[PDB]
């Protein structure tokens, strides 16, 4: 009839009852100090609360605090004092613990959604996931957890309905318990599914543009590709993109090809052009394809692995676009070792340096011609230094993605620790819902109910072990 029933399991002699009391007190105090440490290092750091991706850390710690302090409070009113709790105090205590667990699950929910938006929609992440939106969503989750916790205090106790209610929880009705555990279990299984999908899909896509999936060597693959196109060996150039006027300078490339067709070095310059669009530019490309034997034009839709094979086979890639907001084509080319000769516009300005490719003016067939003959002259010597420099430059643009994967791994670790800690306890409530029990099941309920405080203990250890930024912030105080 009282919260904190320690008088059960009379095996505890007074020689060890004080030991149990002092270990529970020290564990509760340790959890409280760890949680306040996590909050104060979060709030004294500008770089941690300004990132929404870390926000749930604070939320998680706050939820664990609701499991810590309440426990300590509940441990004082029965040993240090002997105040018998009424219905209101028992309802408040049980509501606080249930609110702590539900807020933990909801924080994992919002963290999973943020991870999906960050990893698999990286262009939309910095505009969708804002700080006010994340704060509002966390507040809404906390308030709905608080409301569903405090529902029995508003008149959903079992003496009001005049019906049968639970035995391990006096003044708690059966229907409220099964509804709460159903909601929490459904949300937990959804989060397991979501994190599994996020980590699975990002594994097969983050590392796709790399030569580790390409067999053979450079010159052998180039010779096989050029024989596949019915050409001899030579300095190869590539273009892939949309066939339109205004976005990508395919017409600039065609004018440059026409200009180089009148020169004496066109026999050492093979060209591949991939794309589709307006019929006039397609017709011009096809006319240059039939006029010269060393220019190949592909119109049909291609597979991603075919483009990966093409990037690591050709020597140079031309990106003469007018408006390039992202330059993903440059990243995919440079990751596979293909020296770019691109236009210095948009996102192409700050990705190619003076030692990682050649830069031209936008919409300049003459400057493109000069750069392509300069690249032809440069290709006479060795080129492996430029290939390794481009690989080092382009692999340095995926560092944020790898840290996002590491954060998602940390979140999966936190989720499975929470699952391990709260599994058997919610299983005891499940078996309470379906069938009665004896005193042994209540005993193991009381024994494994300390796993909640153990979860609150081990969460800041995971936070300090995994996060480098949090570790550096903690090392900044001393």
């Amino acid at each position: 009839e009282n919260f904190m029933d320690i008088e059960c399991f009379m095996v505890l002699n007074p020689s060890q009852q004080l030991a149990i009391a002092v270990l529970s007190l020290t564990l509760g105090t340790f959890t409280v100090l760890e949680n306040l440490l996590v909050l104060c290092v979060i709030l004294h750091s500008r770089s941690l609360r300004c990132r929404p991706s870390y926000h749930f850390i604070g939320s998680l710690a706050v939820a664990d605090l609701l499991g810590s302090v309440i426990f300590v409070y509940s441990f004082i009113d029965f040993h240090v004092f002997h105040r018998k709790d009424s219905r209101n105090v028992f309802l408040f205590k049980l509501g606080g613990v249930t609110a702590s667990f539900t807020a933990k699950v909801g924080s994992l929910f919002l963290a999973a959604i943020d991870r999906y938006i960050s990893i698999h929609r990286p262009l939309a992440y910095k505009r969708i996931v804002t700080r006010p939106k994340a704060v509002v969503a966390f507040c809404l989750m906390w308030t709905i957890a608080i409301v569903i916790a405090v529902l029995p205090l508003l008149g959903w106790n079992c003496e009001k309905l005049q019906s049968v209610c639970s035995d391990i929880f006096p003044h708690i009705d059966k229907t409220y318990l099964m509804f709460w555990i159903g909601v929490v279990s459904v949300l937990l299984l959804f989060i397991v599914y979501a994190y599994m999908y996020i980590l699975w899909k990002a594994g097969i896509d983050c590392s796709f543009w790399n030569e580790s999936y390409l067999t053979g060597s450079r010159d052998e693959r180039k010779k096989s590709l050029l024989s596949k196109f019915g050409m001899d060996e030579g300095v190869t150039f590539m273009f892939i993109g949309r066939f339109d006027r205004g976005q990508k300078g395919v017409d600039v490339l065609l004018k440059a090809i026409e200009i180089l067709s009148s020169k004496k070095e066109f026999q050492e310059m093979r060209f591949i052009i991939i794309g589709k669009g307006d019929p006039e530019l397609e017709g011009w490309a096809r006319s240059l394809e039939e006029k010269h034997g060393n220019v190949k034009v592909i119109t049909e839709m291609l597979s991603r692995e075919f483009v990966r094979e093409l990037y690591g086979s050709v020597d140079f890639v031309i990106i003469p676009s007018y408006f390039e907001p992202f330059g993903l084509v440059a990243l995919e080319a440079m990751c596979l070792g293909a020296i770019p000769i691109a236009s210095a516009v948009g996102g192409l300005r700050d990705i190619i340096t003076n030692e990682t490719g050649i830069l031209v003016k936008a919409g300049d067939p003459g400057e493109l011609a000069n750069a392509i003959l300069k690249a032809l002259e440069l290709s006479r010597s060795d080129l492996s230094k430029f290939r390794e420099n481009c690989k080092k430059r382009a692999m340095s643009f995926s560092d944020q993605a790898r840290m996002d994967i590491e954060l998602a791994k940390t979140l999966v670790l936190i989720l499975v620790v929470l699952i391990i800690c709260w599994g058997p306890l919610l299983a005891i409530m499940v078996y309470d819902v379906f069938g009665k029990m004896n005193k042994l099941i209540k005993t193991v309920f009381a024994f494994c109910s300390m796993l909640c405080l153990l979860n609150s203990t081990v969460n800041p250890i995971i936070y300090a072990l995994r996060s480098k930024d949090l570790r550096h912030a903690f090392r900044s105080m001393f």
Partner: nanobody
Amino acid sequence: VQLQESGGGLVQAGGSLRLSCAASGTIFGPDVMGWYRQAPGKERELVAGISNGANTYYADSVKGRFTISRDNAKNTVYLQMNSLKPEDTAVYYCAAEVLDYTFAYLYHAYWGQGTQVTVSS
């Protein structure tokens, strides 16, 4: 997705105008957005484009007189033009492309109905 445009009509020469285009998508809607113009009996031309921040492109014939802005709270684009010249009488379309991060060749483009802009001297 669905796109709605507003701001067409007749403008006295030398004036200024605001065009608005709103999109209804499910996740951020369009990644990149743009305004196109089509003169009567002429091909479409890229007159404005933006993704976010300082990623604005204006054509060489409209540079310095056309500015593009994007509001992300309502997911819309605004085109401001000033000192209009009578070769700008055209049907303006709102184009919105989502582009895939995994494969740079993939893109999906969506279009508006277009509004007629007649500038008269």
